[PDB]
Design a protein around this ligand. Structure first.
Ligand SMILES: [Mg+2]
Ligand SMILES: [Zn+2]
Length: 338
């Protein structure tokens, strides 16, 4: 409620794609997640759905944010606040509003919030090659994603005042828990193309086939019916969280550049440590002594971003994101200056 003015201002237009997430970071003194989380969850009326008090929610957001490492250049609570913001923006789209159910929305906003909790600023490959405790605990399989989901539930249900799921019916909770877990696990990149291709094959292609019959009222129900199956809602949710997770290149140029700097430094640090410990270098190209951040971003965009957002845009209609992506791609291209 009574939020210090500067923070209240930094959160004024959070429903718009162009949002100064870094001013939120500065204003909140590296606590953007609890503040943006509170406003978003309220706007979506989540406790009124889970039957929790703003007090229980505040405690929950506090312990989650506290478990995001501020020392990480990229994977700190600001990244999650940002992903939370993109998630809300997507949930607010007509196509998504008329396809997903309130419980899916709840799962999505919560998944975004916790999807990277306690991230160590190192990739799964690093943890595995290092024989890290987490890698041994998760048998070198989806190591970090499994950890993010697991730790989040441990912190949530391990203390009564943090458990935002306390007042739920076992069944509804079970359904919500499975949905949250699925979205968090869907952020593991090794499965990137699998998730994207399934979205294209089960959603965009079939839908395009139906949108030929015309705007028949009897045709709409056919579409509405097809896109609302539990299977497709799951694929849509997976696509939604994945796109929110790597939406940096679709942000206003100033922000896009800052995110590239942050993730680059995080990757550079890992490379320096790998060569030090003698561990195998998993990201040979990501060395601070030889890597061009602009060329790397261009490759990243061309390899993953372009096709995934093409499909997401085709399904949801996201002209703002696509225009920024083009402008940003051009910006990186324009830096060659040689
Ligand atoms: Mg992650
Ligand atoms: Zn993430």
């Amino acid at each position: 409620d009574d939020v210090p003015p500067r923070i209240a201002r930094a959160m004024e237009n959070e429903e718009y794609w162009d949002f100064d997430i870094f001013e939120l970071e500065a204003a909140t003194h590296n606590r953007p997640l609890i503040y943006l989380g509170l406003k978003m969850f309220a706007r979506f009326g989540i406790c009124e759905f889970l039957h929790c008090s703003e007090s229980t929610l505040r405690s929950w957001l506090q312990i989650i944010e506290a478990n995001y490492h501020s020392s990480n250049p990229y994977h700190n609570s600001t990244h999650s606040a940002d992903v939370l913001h993109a998630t809300a923006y997507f949930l607010s789209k007509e196509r998504i509003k008329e396809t997903l159910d309130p419980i899916d929305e709840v799962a999505a906003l919560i998944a975004a919030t916790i999807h990277d909790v306690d991230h160590p600023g190192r990739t799964n490959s690093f943890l595995c090659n290092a024989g890290s405790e987490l890698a041994i605990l998760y048998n070198d399989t989806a190591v970090l994603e499994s950890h993010h989901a697991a730790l989040a539930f441990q912190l949530t249900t391990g203390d009564d005042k943090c458990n935002i799921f306390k007042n739920m019916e076992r069944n509804d909770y079970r359904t919500l828990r499975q949905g949250i877990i699925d979205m968090v696990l869907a952020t593991e990149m090794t499965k990137h193309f699998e998730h994207v291709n399934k979205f294209v094959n089960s959603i965009n292609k079939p839908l395009a086939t139906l949108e030929e019959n015309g705007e028949t009222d009897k045709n709409q129900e056919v579409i509405n019916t097809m896109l609302r199956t539990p299977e497709n809602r799951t694929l849509i949710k997976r696509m939604l969280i994945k796109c929110a997770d790597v939406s940096n290149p679709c942000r206003p140029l100033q922000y896009c550049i800052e995110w590239a700097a942050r993730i680059s430094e995080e990757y550079f640090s890992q490379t320096d440590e790998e060569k030090q410990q003698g561990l195998p270098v998993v990201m040979p190209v990501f060395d601070r002594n030889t890597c061009s951040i602009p060329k790397s971003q261009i490759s990243f965009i061309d390899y993953f971003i372009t096709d995934m957002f093409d499909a997401w845009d085709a399904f949801v209609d996201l002209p703002d994101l696509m225009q920024h992506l083009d402008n940003n791609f051009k910006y990186w291209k324009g830096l060659d200056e040689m």
